[PDB]
RNA sequence: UGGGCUACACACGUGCUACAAUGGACAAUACAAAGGGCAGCGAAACCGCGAGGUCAAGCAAUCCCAUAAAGUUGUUCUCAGUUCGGAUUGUAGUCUGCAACUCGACUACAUGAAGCUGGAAUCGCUAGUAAUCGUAGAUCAGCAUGCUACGGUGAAUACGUUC
């Protein structure tokens, strides 16, 4: 429980316990599970008090930052409110991407019905 | 520091990966693994922090992502 | 203890030859560190928020009261906080807890301090005070620390916090 | 979106690549809403719609990699 | 030529995919029918995380697309807004095209919302039948949950004419 903020869950498999952290989950969690003495065997909160050090030193080496680059999606997105399209007037007037804005139950961006 | 009502706290050694520069106090207690004498010869169980390895200011992080900059020849 | 001797070896020659004071005992000392933590519930939640601060600094913590019993929430003499003074062996130690790094989202705290020559801060949750554990705490225990100096210039407060990230 | 030359319409290139000489500002008269932004674009507007609009759109240093002159919308909502 | 037929607080039809443990993931692992393909179908071995790219012999029971899938044996998650579901949303591609912004489709990278078998009411079915996962086709350069066709697994129930 040290990776990004905390990694809350105990006694799961680590290959999906590293999904609760942001930016890594279920398929690059297999990939970033790349270390000797690091294998999922129902020891999430066990089997490692120094072996955990390599598998977040490499995450600090893993260039896409996980949580430190939460500013870049709003850098890109807020950059796209220069009024072109595809974020421009799905947010300045707030309809939804999905190409059919009122014919079906578009409620995933709508408040209610 | 009137008697009785307070929980006890005393020094530790915080075994950081960079010089372990913490001998200050705290309420945490566990098994004294590696005692010292240059620091507080006490409960050494303060485990590890991320104090002096990468500050957002007094260090260097990785570079920024991407400008316009079509350096791929489209 | 080593933080005090750096206050008695490092900042002595610096602040007396950058601000250019005359005498030697003129540097801004650090006075009390007050820690106040309000509670949004005038009923029962403060029964479970007593123990949170006592894990960070074991002084018991006063439960204050209101003064006026204002408009639409509470009547007179409830509890809505927990001030704790921290003065000498704690003010050289809780300010020596430079592990707000656990918060990590741009630990640079503030730029504008306040107009009079004190310096107040903020936190959010179980980040700082690394003695506590993130298991038994399903509530945002967020605090409001302070730092007041004997100096009478906010420029002097800009220099004096040289070792806490801004 | 592929490799091989992001498909500026060529007559627009014919206008711009020799239009950039002096300090004059006569912009487009195009209504070809297809081409992307070549990086060698000077300060000028455009006219990018043909039903009824010549919306003068800014060539300002936006994310120039978009394969569209889509700064000009087509309809209203309310 | 270039916009539109797709726009939007909304109202209702049809269809699909799901709320989990007779379920999910994971490698291994058998058995069909009906179809199309002479610039079309495309193997084998090859370079890619996959979407695919190059070349490339065989060609109408024989050749190609073309591994059917469900299930069996076995590992594992162990009853959770959850290793349930992919709705949403940016980057980085592929292909068809003169071009994919308005306005396609698919892939892996994180993002992971609504939802606990659904009020009043209301439909469809009597043995290879409803349900279950699949197969092919026309339309068509490219793009179907619809559409008409085809096999596999396969029950429960009908004493009675009163409403
Ligand atoms: Mg129509
Ligand atoms: Mg084959």
Swiss-Prot record, chain A:
GO MF annotation, one: rRNA binding
GO BP term, pick one: translation
Alphabetically ordered keywords of this record: Ribonucleoprotein, Ribosomal protein, RNA-binding, rRNA-binding, tRNA-binding
Region annotated Disordered, chain positions: 90-113
GO cellular component labels: cytosol; small ribosomal subunit
UniProt cross-references to InterPro entries, sorted A to Z: Rbsml_uS13_C, Ribosomal_uS13, Ribosomal_uS13-like_H2TH, Ribosomal_uS13_bac-type, Ribosomal_uS13_CS
Known role: Located at the top of the head of the 30S subunit, it contacts several helices of the 16S rRNA. In the 70S ribosome it contacts the 23S rRNA (bridge B1a) and protein L5 of the 50S subunit (bridge B1b), connecting the 2 subunits; these bridges are implicated in subunit movement. Contacts the tRNAs in the A and P-sites.
Subunit annotation: Part of the 30S ribosomal subunit. Forms a loose heterodimer with protein S19. Forms two bridges to the 50S subunit in the 70S ribosome.
PANTHER family registered for this protein in UniProt: 30S RIBOSOMAL PROTEIN S13/40S RIBOSOMAL PROTEIN S18 (PTHR10871), SMALL RIBOSOMAL SUBUNIT PROTEIN US13M (PTHR10871:SF1)
Membership in a protein family: Belongs to the universal ribosomal protein uS13 family.
UniProt-recorded name of the protein: Small ribosomal subunit protein uS13
Species whose genome carries this gene: Staphylococcus aureus (strain NCTC 8325 / PS 47)
Curated annotation (Swiss-Prot), chain B:
Domain of life, source organism: Bacteria
Presence of the UniProt keyword Metal-binding in the record: no
Record bears the keyword Translocase: no
Coiled coil: none
Assembly, per entry: Part of the 50S ribosomal subunit.
Pfam assignment, any one: Ribosomal_L31
Entry similarity comment: Belongs to the bacterial ribosomal protein bL31 family. Type B subfamily.
InterPro entries for this protein: Ribosomal_bL28/bL31-like_sf, Ribosomal_bL31, Ribosomal_bL31_B, Ribosomal_bL31_sf
Keywords: Ribonucleoprotein, Ribosomal protein
Recorded GO CC terms: ribonucleoprotein complex; ribosome
A GO molecular-function descriptor: structural constituent of ribosome
GO biological process, one term: translation
Name assigned to this protein: Large ribosomal subunit protein bL31B
From Swiss-Prot, chain C:
Keyword Transmembrane applies: no
Cited InterPro entries: Ribosomal_uL5, Ribosomal_uL5_bac-type, Ribosomal_uL5_C, Ribosomal_uL5_CS, Ribosomal_uL5_dom_sf, Ribosomal_uL5_N
Gene Ontology molecular function: RNA binding; rRNA binding; structural constituent of ribosome; tRNA binding
Domain of life: Bacteria
Keywords, ordered alphabetically: Ribonucleoprotein, Ribosomal protein, RNA-binding, rRNA-binding, tRNA-binding
Keyword set includes Protein biosynthesis: no
GO BP term, pick one: translation
Annotated transmembrane regions: none
Pfam family, one: Ribosomal_L5_C
GO cellular component terms, semicolon-separated: cytosolic large ribosomal subunit
Family the UniProt entry places it in: Belongs to the universal ribosomal protein uL5 family.
Function: This is one of the proteins that bind and probably mediate the attachment of the 5S RNA into the large ribosomal subunit, where it forms part of the central protuberance. In the 70S ribosome it contacts protein S13 of the 30S subunit (bridge B1b), connecting the 2 subunits; this bridge is implicated in subunit movement. Contacts the P site tRNA; the 5S rRNA and some of its associated proteins might help stabilize positioning of ribosome-bound tRNAs.
Subunit structure, interactors included: Part of the 50S ribosomal subunit; part of the 5S rRNA/L5/L18/L25 subcomplex. Contacts the 5S rRNA and the P site tRNA. Forms a bridge to the 30S subunit in the 70S ribosome.
Record protein name field: Large ribosomal subunit protein uL5
UniProtKB/Swiss-Prot annotation, chain D:
One GO BP: ribosomal small subunit assembly
GO cellular component: cytoplasm; small ribosomal subunit
Any one GO molecular-function label of the UniProt entry: rRNA binding
Keywords: Ribonucleoprotein, Ribosomal protein, RNA-binding, rRNA-binding
Function: Protein S19 forms a complex with S13 that binds strongly to the 16S ribosomal RNA.
Family recorded in the similarity comment: Belongs to the universal ribosomal protein uS19 family.
Official protein name in the record: Small ribosomal subunit protein uS19
């Amino acid at each position: 429980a040290r990776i990004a903020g905390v990694d809350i869950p105990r006694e799961k498999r680590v290959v999906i316990s590293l999904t609760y952290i942001y930016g890594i989950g279920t398929s690059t969690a297999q990939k970033i599970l790349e270390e000797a003495n690091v294998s999922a065997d129902t020891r999430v909160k066990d089997l490692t008090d120094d072996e955990l050090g390599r598998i977040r030193e490499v995450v600090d080496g893993y260039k896409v930052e996980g949580d430190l680059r939460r500013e870049t999606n709003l850098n890109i997105k807020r950059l796209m409110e220069i009024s072109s399209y595809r974020g421009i007037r799905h947010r300045r007037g707030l309809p939804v991407r999905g190409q059919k804005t009122k014919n079906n139950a578009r409620t995933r961006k709508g408040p209610v019905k | 520091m009137k008697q009785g009502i307070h929980p006890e706290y005393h020094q530790v050694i915080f075994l950081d990966t960079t010089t372990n520069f913490k001998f200050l106090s705290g309420s945490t207690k566990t098994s004294s693994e590696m005692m010292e004498w240059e620091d507080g010869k006490e409960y050494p169980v303060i485990r590890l922090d991320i104090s002096s390895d990468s500050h957002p200011f007094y260090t260097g992080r990785q570079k920024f992502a991407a400008a316009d900059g079509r350096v791929e020849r489209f | 203890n080593r933080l005090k001797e750096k206050f008695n070896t490092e900042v002595t020659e610096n602040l007396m030859k950058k601000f250019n004071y005359s005498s030697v005992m003129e540097v801004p000392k650090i006075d009390k560190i007050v820690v106040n933590m309000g509670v949004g519930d005038a009923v029962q939640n403060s029964k479970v928020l007593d123990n949170a601060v006592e894990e960070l600094e074991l002084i018991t913590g006063q439960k204050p009261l209101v003064t006026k019993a204002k408009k639409s929430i509470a009547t007179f003499r409830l509890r809505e906080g927990m001030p704790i003074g921290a003065k000498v062996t704690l003010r050289g130690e809780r300010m020596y807890e430079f592990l707000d790094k656990l918060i990590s989202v741009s630990l640079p705290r503030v730029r504008d301090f306040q107009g009079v020559s004190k310096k107040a801060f903020d936190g959010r949750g179980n980040y700082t005070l690394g003695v506590k554990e993130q298991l038994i705490f399903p509530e945002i225990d967020y605090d409001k620390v302070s730092k007041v100096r004997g100096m009478d210039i906010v420029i002097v407060t800009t220099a004096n916090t040289d070792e806490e990230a801004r | 979106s592929i490799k091989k030359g992001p498909f500026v319409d060529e007559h627009l290139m014919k206008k711009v690549e020799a239009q950039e000489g002096s300090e004059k500002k006569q912009v487009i008269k195009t209504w070809s809403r297809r081409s992307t932004i070549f990086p060698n674009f000077i300060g000028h507007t455009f006219a990018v719609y043909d039903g009824r609009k010549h919306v003068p759109v800014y060539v300002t240093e936006d994310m120039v990699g978009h394969k569209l002159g889509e700064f000009a919308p087509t309809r209203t909502f309310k």
